[PDB]
């Protein structure tokens, strides 16, 4: 790999610099290199990994949605403009699928297999569901098997998180948020999405009294994200 000659610590250092500079493609390349050194990631390092690729694929998805909307308008009275729109939508789509494949490969080689603690195993299985979900957004003979891969990854994370984490754990809450949106807009199951967001919110609310002040800024953010989705869907 291109990062094979760089020290692990230097890669982590440079991923943090790329974060400050909003250079997320670099940040992702540095963390991929860090993963490929073969050592487990710490908590802070897991977050660098997920933020980096979340922003890369996020930009690819937003641009894919722009082009797809134009493509759909070109198939309504619309004047033939040629193959360029489909071609460029495909170009962005293939790049997007490539990043998703790269992230799924890191998880498979070998992050998930070596993660024993719940905080890491759930984190990586959530990521697996996320990037299979992103593949499902653009799938049209294959969508069903990609959707089931995402659900299977989410479901196993859900099982572990319920057994091994408190209801206020930020990873458990963030998993539930994304698995609920999976139900809503991918798996055509809005009632399951609503039920999941409500029980998740309600069970974390009941657990807040156990928590230190200002030690759960991320959990409180995600609870508001659950509440926002519910208001939008009901």
């Amino acid at each position: 790999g291109a990062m094979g000659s760089m020290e692990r610590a230097s890669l982590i250092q440079k991923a943090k610099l790329a974060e400050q500079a909003e250079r997320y493609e670099d940040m992702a390349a540095f963390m991929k290199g860090a993963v490929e050194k073969g050592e487990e990631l710490s908590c802070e390092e897991r977050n660098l990994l997920s933020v980096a690729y979340k922003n890369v694929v996020g930009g690819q998805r937003a641009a894919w949605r722009v082009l797809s909307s134009i493509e759909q308008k070109s198939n309504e009275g619309s004047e033939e403009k040629g193959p360029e729109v489909r071609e460029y939508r495909e170009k962005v789509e293939t790049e997007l699928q490539g990043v998703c494949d790269t992230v799924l490969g890191l998880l498979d080689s070998h992050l998930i297999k070596e993660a024993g603690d719940a905080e890491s195993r759930v984190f990586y299985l959530k990521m697996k569901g996320d990037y299979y979900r992103y593949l499902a957004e653009v799938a049209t003979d294959d969508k069903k098997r990609i959707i089931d891969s995402a659900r299977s990854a989410y479901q196993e994370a859900m099982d572990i998180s319920k057994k091994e984490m408190p209801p206020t754990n930020p990873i458990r809450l963030g998993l539930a948020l994304n698995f609920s949106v999976f139900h809503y807009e991918i798996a055509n199951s809005p009632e399951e999405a609503i039920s999941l967001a409500k029980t998740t919110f309600d069970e974390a609310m009941a657990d807040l009294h156990t928590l230190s002040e200002d030690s759960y800024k991320d959990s409180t953010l995600i609870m508001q994200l659950l509440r926002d989705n519910l208001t939008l869907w009901t």
Binding site: N178, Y184, I222, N229, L232, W233
Partner: peptide, 5 residues
């Protein structure tokens, strides 16, 4: 604008 994280 549903949220994911």
């Amino acid at each position: 604008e549903r949220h994911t994280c």
